[PDB]
């Protein structure tokens with residue numbers, strides 16, 4: 066999660082630079098002369114075994130989707146058994162057959178994974 | 188009496204298929220294909236590039252089938268004969 | 270397996286691991302390049318304990334921090350020390366290497382170049398994840414045991 | 417879409433002579449097949465059974 | 466034989482559980498990937514063998 | 522402006538993974554900062570070294586208008602229409618590259634046509 | 638098939654023909670059998686063509 | 694194939710599109726697929742698309 070910033074003025078991409086003196090992280094633009102202090106110090110992230118994309122597809126209409134399969138488990142938020150489940154939408158071989166369900170009453174995504182590690186699933 | 192809202196049975200499908208074939212026959216993919224050409228797509232080709240730097244081409248008229256008779260009448264051509 | 274040890278399901282494994290080409294890629298959860306300028310105090314909590322521990326019986330402010338996965342980490346019968354002193358013997362001195370030890374709940378290799386830095390690092394990060402051979406014979410990818 | 421094989425797959429002991437056909441688990445059907453024997457062309461439409 | 470057919474129908478429907486159990490198992494994420502084989506790779510492998518042990 | 526370009530590609534400000542894939546694209550097109558330099562850049566890779574800037578730009582202006590994605594529009598005012606489509610292309614391409622999408626099934630029949 | 642729901646990994650879905658040929662095949666079974674069949678003939682044509690030339 | 698734009702609340706578009714085609718008002722041969730989990734609604738009008746008839750099951 067290296068959420069990265071564009072300049073206030075010219076709206077190009079900002080590139081990380083060091084304040085050599087005070088030892089801290091700037092982010093100059095290389096078009097205008099704009100610069101801002103860095104938020105996190107994290108400049109780069111490479112997620113080898115990824116998650117983001119497993120949730121991708123979750124729309125206000127996902128349940129209107131007739132091709133989706135429908136189970137009657139209970140959602141850990143509103144208990145309604147109007148669910149519509151799909152497998153992790155990432156398209157890796159090294160994906161599980163972990164099901165994701167969407168509560169069609171409170172639009173809550175929950176999981177069949179008994180090894181739950183994440184909180185937002187995003 | 189045979190409620191005209193009674194659900195369809197597996198048998199009835201054939202009726203609908205009969206209708207389908209009554210209407211389209213077995214080679215509609217050909218005919219319609221060729222027809223949409225003759226009716227529209229044809230005339231639509233005579234309007235693209237129908238301008239020369241003038242001479243512009245307008246309507247298209249497709250005759251009934253006919254023969255270039257060597258010695259004689261441009262003749263109504265019947266498929267069998269042809 | 271050598272005549273005397275054929276049944277040893279554990280030696281079949283021990284050979285399997287010491288044969289199956291095992292790259293850094295296969296054992297690292299994620300890489301991250303931090304700006305972390307002070308080589309003593311650190312803008313990363315989970316590493317304060319590890320720099321302290323590497324002061325008991327040059328460097329760029331840019332840090333390449335690898336978080337490794339125990340699962341595949343002990344599965345391939347591997348030490349932090351081993352992964353570590355591998356990278357440290359792959360990049361001569363041209364890289365300052367330091368790693369969390371094998372007890373610490375998070376396994377971490379922290380690496381610095383030793384200014385065009387953020388770019389030499391994304392290169393080195395790749396020269397690690399792809400190229401470096403932690404364990405095994407190159408080209409041996411799967412190694413299945415069978416009776 | 418989700419298509420029913422036989423209309424009777426919409427419907428909300430079994431003949432041992434009969435084949436074993438899949439359950440009708442869905443109130444999601446958007447269509448049903450006219451007749452599945454219409455998946456065949458001409459040549460195949462002549463083959464009995 | 467009328468009965469053989471029930472044994473046969475049973476034999477099959479006895480594998481569709483096996484397959485179903487491995488399904489549930491794997492959807493839970495409880496199937497351990499066989500070394501150097503993906504979950505999805507090894508789930509199928511099981512299913513296919515069940516369904517063959519069955520046919521057979 | 523980068524921000525704008527990326528918005529055409531990456532319809533999701535949190536999708537830091539995709540935007541991070543493009544990081545080098547934004548760099549790869551750094552040298553060029555205005556439509557004319559860009560149009561010129563293209564012009565030059567479509568033209569012999571003798572040709573004059575205007576003509577060059579004009580060649581790249583006609584290619585983008587008629588050759589580049591011609592099934593969108595071949596007339597003038599539709600540059601946002603292509604940018605957006607082209608973004609969507611780059612999108613799908615990356616969405617595939619990020620192991621987030623299965624590469625298109627070449628043998629799906631819905632995406633065939635029977636010529637008759 | 639467009640006759641199953643999305644992410645259906647059951648035998649019936651993924652192509653187990655449950656029935657004997659005596660019993661007859663369901664349309665899906667019939668089409669999946671047709672799929673396996675076409676695989677057979679396709680590379681029965683390959684095996685004939687490559688083998689033809691190996692032998693020579 | 695042409696991206697023509699965007700629509701928030703597609704299902705309400707989708708209904709109509711379907712209902713129009715089911716009247717005759719949009720040509721029957723015209724094909725409309727909504728990919729719910731892709732945010733896409735692709736309409737097809739070009740010739741060459743092989744299609745077949747089905748019974749409409751509607752609630």
Ligand SMILES: [Zn+2]
Nearest residue numbers: 072075094097
């Ligand atoms: Zn700027």
Ligand SMILES: [Zn+2]
Nearest residue numbers: 140143168173
């Ligand atoms: Zn819920």
